[PDB]
Amino acid sequence: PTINQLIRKGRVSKVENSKSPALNKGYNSFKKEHTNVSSPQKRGVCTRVGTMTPKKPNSALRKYARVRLTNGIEVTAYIPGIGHNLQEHSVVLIRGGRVKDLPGVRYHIVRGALDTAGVENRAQGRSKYGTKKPKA
Template identity: 55%
Template sequence: MFLSALRASARLIPRMGAAPIGVARSVVRPALMTRPLQMAFSTTPRPQATINQIRKTGLFKVNRKRTKAKISETPDLEGCPQKSGVVLKVMILKPRKPNSANRKAARVRLSNDRIVTAYIPGEGHNAQEHSVVLVRGGRTKDLPGVKYKCVRGSHDLAGVPNRRNARSKYGTKRPTE
């Protein structure tokens, strides 16, 4: 296989004594062929292509595609969509520049005994120490090191009260009218 492809690519490379580059053999007049060779040819023989040159130019097909293993953005979830955990501490974090606010977050010990910092979305919350919460992946861009979010309306963490839009993201029931 390899040798047959190498031989086929060697046939594509011009040899010494061929017609000048860019000129077909039938176009060259016999009078020009009888004259001594001038500037059209180099007197040194043309080097053969190396195997690496053939491989790079695509004359010989080599499968060069290598897929990189994707690094998980939420390694502490161990491939699970969510994990439950117990709140160790509720804290208020300051976002990085240029934002200014007080972001609510919690240190959570997951069911696999890993401790993570999880953001608590929405206005107000009832999370306190020893509350059981469900943690999902998803970083908060302006809080360094926070790669997880608590799921509102699940376990001990209540949904956001009086929420009208995007209720499913904040665990709010449909209001009865």
């Protein structure tokens, strides 16, 4: 609008969140607080691995991890591969991936982590899902 209206209020600029909140904060022990690291990827510990359903028209039951990171925050992640490898108390590296279909989980588990061996018999999609080149 008018100019003197703009000067003593300013343009109140638009603040946007991240694509995933639980990658943006790290932990340090003896400080006993909750640092702002903005690291991409973290290694986490699974606690409960049950499975459940997606929400709507797609109805085919998913894999539903629940992982606990090194920040201290327990965020349910997702297992992408064709069948899993994980059991309780494992090493789980997490990249930022949005799952529209499942309610609440916004974290893939990197199939191909330190503990996640690659999915069985996969040729296409080699870099994803952690499989080596089979034989050359």
